[PDB]
Design a protein around this nucleic acid. Structure first.
Ligand SMILES: [Zn+2]
Lengths: 135, 85, 101, 50, 155, 60, 97, 119
RNA sequence: AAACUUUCAACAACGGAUCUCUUGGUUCUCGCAUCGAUGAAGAACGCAGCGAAAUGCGAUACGUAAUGUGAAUUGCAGAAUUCCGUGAAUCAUCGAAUCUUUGAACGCACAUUGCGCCCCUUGGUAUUCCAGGGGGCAUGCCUGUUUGAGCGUCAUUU
RNA sequence: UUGACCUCAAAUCAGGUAGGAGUACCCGCUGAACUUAAGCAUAUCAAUAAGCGGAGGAAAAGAAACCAACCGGGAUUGC
RNA sequence: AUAUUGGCGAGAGACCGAUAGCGAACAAGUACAGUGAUGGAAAGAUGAAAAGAACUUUGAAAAGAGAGUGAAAAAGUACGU
RNA sequence: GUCGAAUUUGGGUAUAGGGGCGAAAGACUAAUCGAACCAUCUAGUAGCUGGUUCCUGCCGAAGUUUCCCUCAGGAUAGCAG
RNA sequence: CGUGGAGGUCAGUGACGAAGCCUAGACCGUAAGGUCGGGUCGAACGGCCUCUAGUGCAGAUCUUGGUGGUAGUAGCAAAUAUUCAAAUGAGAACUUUGAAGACUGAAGUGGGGAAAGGUUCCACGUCAACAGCAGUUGGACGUGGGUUAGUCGAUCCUAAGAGAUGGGGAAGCUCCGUUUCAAAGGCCUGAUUUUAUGCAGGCCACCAUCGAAAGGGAAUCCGGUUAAGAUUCCGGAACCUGG
């Protein structure tokens, strides 16, 4: 779990916000892996990742990285999409396969809160729309 | 004696001139500036400090290079020279 | 309430030991190869006063079995030990005062 | 202090050159508005805080 | 939206022989200690600041809109109403004034004005010319600097 | 006595005074003036006299 | 709070609603843009009819199954019956689903 | 007065270097007489003339290097384009227009037919 | 009866309201996508014949080059040929340069205008010392190159 | 003795690339209390402010492991 | 197709009119305060044109009284009313 | 009062706000301490106090009923337009 | 009834004088108010029909600004103390000089410095404001001049302590740690005199850096000189470091 980083467990609020220990960090452990790798090699683009092993203490993943400056990648149009500036730090913004799993990005009624973005969905239904000729 | 007599012992500067912002906010013993956060890589700013952000943002300085980018965009980042038309 | 005094001791800000005038950590010699098969002879150069410590410290000089140098150790003095006494540290040292059997 | 660093003395040099009234030809320029030096400093009135 | 509120002023409370209005802190300015955040304070925020979601347009029933256009058309054929509005139709032969379709194909202003003066709009075109005056308020320098009468409506 | 640049050291002032006026420099004493500029005290050897070259330069 | 005879109201205005308020002052301006886009798009595709042919289709939801409606595409079985291929039909302004 | 750039471009590398030195000799003398005369506005013309020569000298030397590095990759950074950091990292026209052989076959077999609906 | 106090009017003070303005603000709408290791935003210090600031610029310093227009700038001085013209201008435009010390700031440091290493070149009778000029020396990561380490490990010989 | 291979290194090696600024809008993380409940702890404020990471001219989503139950519809987004 | 209190370039208003409207119509995030984080002003209007009062006189002088400019000094750089 | 020491003191350094530091007074922590200063949330809430801007005309009260963690307040019936 | 603005109308008023302001001058209305005359003034403004609102003040220990009575009043009384004459100036209790009288009395009201200040230093001109009297005087105003180092300091060393790197945590801003579970380097001698430096060799295991103008530390004294600088300038006589 993610231990709440408060000194001596004092939260200074209401009882529902008094939890310290058993809080669960909405992002996955695999996402933390790609984020920490993505900072190490900032010249690369995180493509995907997978599970290799685990023990009691650590969980082990392998990260696939793509070089957007390599001409074997800038050519070969099957892969040169990753070279666009709109794909900078996909892992940071949750554009990876696990990033969209945690974000709830999927189709159906089971994903009503998160189908097109949770912040986007909340802002849309919490806005006052007023026209020139009031309806 | 916490008033006038204590104010006579003030001769030890706690802050000195900064190098990144030059504001005289560089803490001598913490080796840090209380305005911009030097020597940290990022410049210190906060969203609750709206006036503070306004005081040192882009456009308050000379804009030695950014003041010409829009002109170079208008001409489509042209290269070369005029042809003595 | 307020953080009590014995809780402020563990942060170690003004409760760290005063170690400015101390001679050094009083440790035995390293058990490398001579002290477990034979012995090695040392000499008590001086007995000194370690600030903060009741007992006096003995400075003992050995030889390095593997290099030509004069490795020096800081022993806690056992009383009766004098300057110029020969200290034998090893498995085959004799049962005499100051030896490191 | 008599023994001073270079930055302090360099700012001291800039502040000495700014200790000046207006040039008298400035007031006669077309559509002039400035009438005095509004940023004048004095050692006895206001400190530099450098 | 930030007008009158770009300050960290706080109330001094009682005991300082001053009103309990919030006051600008610090010192050495001449603004420190002055009142803030009140509609009665200089440099504060006005009462009920104006919003953009105020109702600007008004919806009218389409059939009621057409009702008033029909009555407006009919009222144009009453010579008593046209004079009462001040349209200088005393010498006009008859109303509704209907002219030939050749007016619809006039391209030049000089010819168009001549046709208007020929049918009896002379005294009404001069009415607008002689009625040009400056506006009587601060609307002069809000792009409404002049006012004048309204002439004939050619259909 | 010259007003020298604020980056020039004593070695550079010697070589320049020799180069620009064809004289021999005995010693150079430099202070930073209170106005933010530098002043060089260039003492010539006994062979030359600064009076004979001050008016040659054009100031007297 | 509660007072004389009136219906119970539910006005969901206990949040910072004034932060998110959309007033459509640009209804007129955005309609000119929409018509200018159609005018500019029409020239770029100058002979083409600016929209794909769409099928007629029954509506779902027995409340609405009594009507027919414009569908999305022409149902690969249907284009084969019509005597042309979907890869080609997509190129001459036929919508295929 | 002053020097004209169109004139200086005719002179050679050594002619301009000697020209520049002579202009430093002149401006040194004007600074000497400025301490005596109440006003010497002539010093601006010599100061502008010095800047013009150094501009023409710099153009001659920079253009010479451009010919040296002509017709090869890896030219000096200050010699090649500046447009924008983001523009310089963008895909080229050749790299942007890369098409797979699968997509190339479909792009010539079934292109967008220019059709019309009148009859 | 004066003086003094109060009231009113006139003239004069104090003060800056009222009126009339407005190169400013605020709100709405429309269009576009353009910061930075090819060193950004920000800072410090400088630069004018006579400037403190604002604006502009960087030791080429209220700026250089290029193009357009076509006779100014202006407070004073000054310059005149810059006036039937490759040409005035505190003009516009701007595609070539300059761009101090810094700053993500990158040789190491930096409450210091502190301390180095390397290459070329010049001088001091100098491959080692001193000085002048020019050019370099951050980290992480990627592709490739070269040089290596490990009985990790494969074949062949005494 | 020689040559490989694997793994791991070093170089001011040959080319690059990341960092900072801005951040109205965008994608995530983290995360309150004032306040309302006429008290108050669940609730509410609010999956909001403050804090952190990452883009673009838009971003995101996006061509069904969908909605449906009908004579079925047919990527996404917005009103 | 959607958003856009930032940037750049434009068009507007039954908005405000110098104690208003942005804090700032001005050398305004300036002067000034604080160790620091931060706090943060006041301050627009002579006249069409300086034509900004030559000259005489009293005064040590500032200035006064004349004289003069101006349509107006009941407009004199403490300047519209 | 003490005045050669559990002394006095400069500079450097370390300890930061439910924290420090305290030979202990809730003392001190920049004239601020039974929880510093700064900005923001925040125009925080207040059944409580104060104020609430033109004229004339006509009509014209209540401090009572029931319920309420209700008793300085509300709902409710009454009284008025 | 009155105010800001808006659509219409009076082909309304107006530089032959709009608005504003003053007026124990006049008239109308019960009133909110309206009209007129006179003065002042200089550029826009009204009547009527409708529309719109940031629309009317005596209060809020209201806000901003200005102004009184108090009031020529309280007061300008610690640190022993001044007096005479001349000079200067329009002007002298206060400036300059001379004379007299006094005080600090060497743990000084003397002579230097550290921190801090920043040009206050010195000079010429000078009194509108400041020096709670005054002022010809000044730390005031205006205009200039002035700070010279191999030997004095910093720079160098380390102290308490601070802090990258290898690593390890943390979603992260960043935290721990200073030799740690690291493959962490240059010094002398030399050698081919294609030639630069790779090779002939040997040595070496600590280990970034920051941290003292009072700690440690290479080496300068005397005499003279300026309006203002001096262990720095000049004269003479020394020493250290590197080569
Ligand atoms: Zn700083």
């Amino acid at each position: 779990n993610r231990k709440r980083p408060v000194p001596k467990g004092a939260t200074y609020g209401k009882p529902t916000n008094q939890g310290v220990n058993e809080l669960k960090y909405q992002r996955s452990l695999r996402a933390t892996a790609e984020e920490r790798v993505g900072r190490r090699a900032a010249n690369l683009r995180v493509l995907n990742s997978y599970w290799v092993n685990q023990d009691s203490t650590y969980k082990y993943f392998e990260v696939i990285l793509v070089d957007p400056q390599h001409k074997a990648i800038r050519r070969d149009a099957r892969y040169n999409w990753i070279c666009d500036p709109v794909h900078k730090h996909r892992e940071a913004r949750g554009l990876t396969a696990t990033g969209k799993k945690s974000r709830g990005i999927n189709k159906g009624h089971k994903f009503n809160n998160t189908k097109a973005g949770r912040r986007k969905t909340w802002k849309r239904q919490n806005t006052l729309s007023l026209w020139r000729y009031r309806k | 004696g916490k008033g006038t007599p204590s104010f006579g012992k003030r001769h030890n500067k706690s802050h000195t001139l900064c190098n990144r912002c030059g504001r005289r906010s560089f803490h001598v013993q913490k080796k840090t500036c209380s305005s911009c956060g030097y020597p940290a890589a990022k410049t210190r700013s906060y969203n609750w400090g709206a006036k503070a952000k306004r005081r040192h943002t882009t456009g308050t300085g000379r804009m030695r290079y950014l003041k010409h980018v829009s002109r170079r965009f208008k001409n489509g980042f042209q290269t070369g020279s005029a042809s003595k038309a | 309430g307020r953080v009590i005094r014995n809780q402020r001791k563990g942060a170690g800000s003004i409760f760290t030991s005063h170690t400015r005038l101390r001679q050094g950590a009083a440790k035995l010699r390293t058990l490398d190869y001579a002290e477990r098969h034979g012995y090695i002879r040392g000499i008590v150069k001086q007995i000194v006063h370690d600030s903060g410590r009741g007992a006096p410290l003995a400075k003992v000089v050995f030889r390095d079995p593997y290099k030509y140098r004069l490795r020096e150790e800081i022993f806690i003095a056992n009383e009766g030990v004098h300057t110029g006494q020969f200290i034998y540290a090893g498995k085959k040292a004799s049962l005499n005062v100051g030896n490191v059997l | 202090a008599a023994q001073k660093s270079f930055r302090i003395k360099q700012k001291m040099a800039k502040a000495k050159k700014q200790n000046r009234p207006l040039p008298q030809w400035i007031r006669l320029r077309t559509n002039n508005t400035i009438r005095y030096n509004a940023k004048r400093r004095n050692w006895r009135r206001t400190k530099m805080n450098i | 939206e930030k007008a009158g509120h770009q300050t960290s002023a706080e109330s001094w409370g009682t005991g300082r022989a001053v009103a309990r209005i919030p006051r600008v802190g610090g010192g050495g300015t001449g603004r420190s200690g002055q009142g803030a955040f009140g509609n009665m304070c200089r440099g504060g925020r006005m009462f009920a600041p104006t919003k953009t979601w105020r109702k600007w347009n008004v919806k009218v029933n389409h059939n009621e809109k057409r009702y008033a256009t029909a009555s407006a058309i009919a009222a144009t054929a009453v010579a008593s109403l046209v004079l009462a509005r001040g349209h200088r139709v005393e010498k006009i032969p008859e109303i509704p004034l209907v002219v030939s379709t050749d007016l619809e194909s006039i391209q030049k202003t000089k010819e168009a004005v001549a046709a208007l003066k020929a049918v009896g709009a002379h005294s009404d075109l001069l009415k607008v010319l002689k009625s040009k005056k400056l506006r009587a308020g601060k609307g002069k320098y809000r792009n409404r600097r002049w006012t004048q009468r309204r002439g004939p409506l050619v259909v | 006595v010259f007003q020298v640049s604020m980056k020039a050291n004593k070695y550079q002032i010697k070589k320049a005074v020799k180069e620009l006026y064809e004289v021999d420099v005995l010693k150079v004493n430099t202070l930073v003036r209170p106005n933010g500029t530098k002043k060089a005290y260039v003492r010539l050897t006994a062979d030359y006299d600064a009076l004979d070259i001050a008016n040659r330069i054009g100031y007297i | 709070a509660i007072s004389k005879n009136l219906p119970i109201l539910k006005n969901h205005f206990r949040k910072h609603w004034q932060e998110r308020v959309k007033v459509h002052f640009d209804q007129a301006g955005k309609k000119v843009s929409r018509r200018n886009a159609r005018a500019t798009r029409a020239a770029k595709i100058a002979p083409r009819p600016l929209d794909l042919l769409r099928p007629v289709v029954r509506a779902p939801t027995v409340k609405y199954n009594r009507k027919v409606r414009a569908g999305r595409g022409f149902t690969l079985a249907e284009v084969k019956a019509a005597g042309l291929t979907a890869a080609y039909a997509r190129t001459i302004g036929i919508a295929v689903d | 007065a002053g020097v004209k750039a169109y004139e200086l471009r005719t002179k050679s590398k050594e002619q301009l270097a000697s020209q520049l030195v002579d202009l430093k000799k002149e401006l040194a003398e004007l600074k000497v007489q400025k301490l005596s005369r109440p006003s010497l506005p002539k010093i601006k013309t010599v100061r502008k003339s010095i800047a013009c020569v150094l501009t023409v000298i710099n153009e001659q030397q920079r253009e010479a290097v451009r010919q040296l590095y002509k017709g090869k990759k890896y030219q000096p950074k200050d010699l090649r384009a500046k447009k924008t950091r983001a523009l310089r990292r963008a895909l080229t026209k050749f790299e942007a227009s890369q098409v797979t052989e699968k997509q190339r076959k479909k792009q010539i077999a079934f292109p967008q037919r220019k059709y019309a609906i009148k009859a």
